[PDB]
Amino acid sequence: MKIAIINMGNNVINFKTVPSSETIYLFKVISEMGLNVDIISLKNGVYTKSFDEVDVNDYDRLIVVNSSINKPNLAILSAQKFMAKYKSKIYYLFTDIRLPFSQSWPNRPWAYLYTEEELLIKSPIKVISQGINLDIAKAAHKKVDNVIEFEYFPIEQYKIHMNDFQLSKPTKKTLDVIYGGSFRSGQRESKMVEFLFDTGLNIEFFGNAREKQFKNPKYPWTKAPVFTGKIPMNMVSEKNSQAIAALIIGDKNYNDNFITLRVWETMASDAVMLIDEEFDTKHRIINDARFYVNNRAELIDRVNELKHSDVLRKEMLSIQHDILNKTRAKKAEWQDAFKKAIDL
């Protein structure tokens, strides 16, 4: 059994970006399962083989991640051409709602260098949805003409199942609330302004976001949180640990559907995980109302309660860490489920 992993829209090497980093980490966790796997990208390196140095059909299973299509680039075109020659099923890891599988064929001046068939992917596609709601996954891929099927798998748990995983340790607190991520084209501007702006608390937003991006008049604010630079993925939990609490906010289509990497990065940290009620209305993450907040007013009060009671804060950290460990205890089941998902 030979497996291949390819990032459909981003070059893969080192850990200079979320897509490239997640690809290497997914590659690593799949290898740790006792599976023979290669990462195929633009160039040969310590973690990858080039498209030009391998025969796509020598692989029994082809896993694909990150579809950047929805202005094609070298990575996208090379991936498309590679997938186009593969004669078997493609297993697409749907980890970001905005990035469903799609062919660049429809998507140009440079079109002169490529032909249709050369990029037309005819293989059936199995969408492995990180989200439990498959109707949402189907809707996101409604434009796909390929034969296609769907199945749910909590892909994002690769963080906690990695062999080197460790909970964050008690850390000196210099922040009230922290959130690490990107602006994501303002798709979450309303929630970000609700929970992170004008709270009167000491809040930090780390990652790609900048204050100048929050300019939609529909979501007014007076004072913004402090924005700091991007840091390595393997430093996110340590960064979250500088704060009393770390926030998880809702997103239409993600709500009551996706559990995101952030959930685990936050749960594993020394910061109490506070969740926007709308993101998990049934409290699947933690069956404890103390970890949920409906709006800004509730977030402020909850953070103040945590600051006033070290007992409450430590108790909640103990609870979230325990819950995280209960999931880590199911590693073998998780590994078996992934294997079944890719027909092994």
Ligand SMILES: O=c1ccn([C@@H]2O[C@H](COP(=O)(O)OP(=O)(O)O[C@H]3O[C@H](CO)[C@@H](O)[C@H](O)[C@H]3O)[C@@H](O)[C@H]2O)c(=O)[nH]1
């Ligand atoms: O300085 C920073 C800030 C954030 N991150 C990472 O970026 C990830 C993604 O954050 P963001 O860009 O805000 O997007 P999310 O919607 O929170 O997460 C997306 O990316 C996750 C990991 O690929 C998936 O689990 C989610 O489903 C997908 O929506 C975080 O989890 C962190 O791992 C960094 O590496 N450095």
